[PDB]
Design a protein around this ligand. Structure first.
Ligand SMILES: Nc1ccn([C@H]2C[C@H](O)[C@@H](COP(=O)(O)OP(=O)(O)OP(=O)(O)O)O2)c(=O)n1
Ligand SMILES: [Mg+2]
Ligand SMILES: [Mg+2]
Ligand SMILES: [Mg+2]
Ligand SMILES: [Mg+2]
Length: 433
DNA sequence: GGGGTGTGGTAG
DNA sequence: ATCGCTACCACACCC
């Protein structure tokens, strides 16, 4: 009952099961809906406007919906009492989402099931629910629909399936801003709960993107938080990890922890940092971004989504990226897979009425000293990453040009088929009509 | 120099 | 078993 990477159904089957593919496709479709819904409606925000940002996202999105939509086989479980996760497997399988009970024992999104099992004391069973992908989309739709129907935002910007940044242009210096915006946060939460038949959202509310994002994290689960620039305090800053800053992930955290000696919070970092030391640790741009965030201000790059959302949400590239289940014996099977991949991308390119004038092939090769079979079944394991790009000349949607060039790019990279653990095929420059 | 390329990082 | 995607920005480098 298993579809391999050299089977013609592989892509279809992989993409049917892959939650990360679904996240990307859903995001791509929401940006498209935004562009189509706002064809005529030119609503833009200028640097002279005063505005409030409501950053809204679902609490434990997949866990909540998978529980409400669960099959008869899982009737007995209780979302308030039981530790519940959404995953495919039983061992080295990613927890896509876990409920707040599971989180009280230390279980976290992205953790393998087997690792999560060990954090439960004896007597307590981990409940594993399947993915309900179509129902995830239906709940998102009800969410976004509720946001519009309220008719209170000048701009509704999709971030993800379960998350949106909503903007209200307002006068400078209004009376009772904290209390009036608390009322809205409460109205929004109740309306979404009713509109989704029982999913909860949290809301971060501020006068900048960065603070509204931090306020949302502080609000979780099932609450709201309002912190304007003028409400900033050491106690607010003391509540956040460094990688709570947008643009700071695993790798930037490590560099910031090294340079500033493992600050426990953003408030510890506020006290220790200089702008010049930040730039040295993490780069000029990101160093500046962080310095600005610690004053509750957005960088110019982040603000582009408010100042010109149609430009920012315009799709500029298209690709597929498959780094799971890649086990080829020879170059013939690789070529067939690339061809299937190019055709899939061409069908999408043709759906959206564009051509491409530049492509890239990117692969993942088993590291010299890594094991032939990694600990995750069909995982890529430790790998080195290599890429080559190619200009096609005239924009085109011709399979013969595109696929021949992709296969050639694979040849230029020189990875033996059996060392291949991952492939991405990319159309880097898109042209309309 | 702007302007290219491959590499690496981030977010749901 | 298990489904580790993908768009985008930044940078080092280069010649
Ligand atoms: N690494 C990830 C991140 C996210 N998701 C999916 C499942 C999540 O439910 C959904 C939204 O991600 P969030 O990061 O908003 O996480 P949750 O909604 O699960 O939890 P929280 O309550 O912290 O927002 O995206 C995933 O499968 N794998
Ligand atoms: Mg979230
Ligand atoms: Mg969420
Ligand atoms: Mg989210
Ligand atoms: Mg972060």
């Amino acid at each position: 009952r298993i579809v391999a990477c050299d089977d013609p159904d592989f892509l279809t089957s992989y993409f049917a099961h892959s939650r990360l593919h679904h996240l990307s496709a859903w995001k791509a479709n929401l940006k498209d809906k935004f562009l189509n819904e706002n064809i005529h409606k030119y609503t833009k925000i200028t640097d002279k406007d005063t505005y409030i940002i409501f950053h809204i996202d679902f609490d434990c999105f997949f866990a909540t919906v998978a529980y409400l939509c669960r099959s008869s086989s899982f009737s007995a479980c209780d979302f308030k009492r039981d530790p519940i996760v959404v995953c495919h497997g039983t061992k080295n399988s990613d927890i896509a989402s876990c409920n707040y009970v599971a989180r009280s024992y230390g279980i976290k999104n992205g953790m393998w099931v087997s690792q999560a099992e060990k954090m439960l004391p004896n007597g307590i069973k981990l409940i594993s629910l399947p993915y309900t992908f179509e129902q995830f989309q239906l709940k998102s739709e009800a969410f976004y629909s509720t946001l519009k129907r309220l008719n209170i935002f000048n701009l509704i910007l999709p971030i993800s399936i379960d998350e949106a940044v909503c903007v209200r242009i307002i006068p400078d210096n209004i009376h009772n801003t904290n209390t009036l915006n608390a009322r809205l946060c409460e109205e929004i939460r109740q309306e979404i709960f009713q509109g989704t038949n029982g999913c909860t959202v949290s809301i971060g509310c501020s006068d900048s993107l960065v603070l509204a994002r931090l306020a949302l994290k502080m609000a979780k689960p099932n609450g709201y938080n309002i912190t304007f620039k003028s409400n900033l305090s050491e106690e607010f800053w003391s509540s956040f990890k460094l990688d709570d800053l947008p643009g700071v992930g695993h790798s930037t955290l490590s560099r910031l922890e090294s340079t500033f000696d493992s600050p426990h919070s953003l408030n510890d970092l506020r006290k220790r940092y200089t702008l010049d030391a930040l730039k040295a640790s993490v780069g000029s741009k990101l160093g500046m971004k962080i310095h600005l965030a610690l004053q509750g201000q957005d960088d110019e790059e982040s603000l582009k989504i408010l100042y010109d959302p149609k430009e920012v949400l315009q799709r500029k590239s298209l690709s597929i990226d498959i780094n799971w289940g890649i086990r080829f014996k020879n170059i013939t099977q690789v070529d067939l897979f690339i061809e299937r991949g190019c055709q899939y991308l061409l069908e999408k390119l043709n759906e959206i009425n564009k051509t491409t004038s530049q492509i890239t092939l990117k692969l993942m090769r088993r590291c010299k000293d890594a094991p032939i079979e990694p600990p995750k079944y069909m995982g890529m394991g430790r790998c080195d990453s290599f890429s080559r790009s190619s200009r096609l000349g005239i924009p085109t949607n011709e399979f013969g040009i595109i696929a021949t060039e992709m296969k050639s790019l694979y040849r230029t990279l020189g990875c033996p088929p059996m060392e291949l653990r991952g492939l991405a095929l990319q159309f880097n420059k898109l042209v309309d009509v």
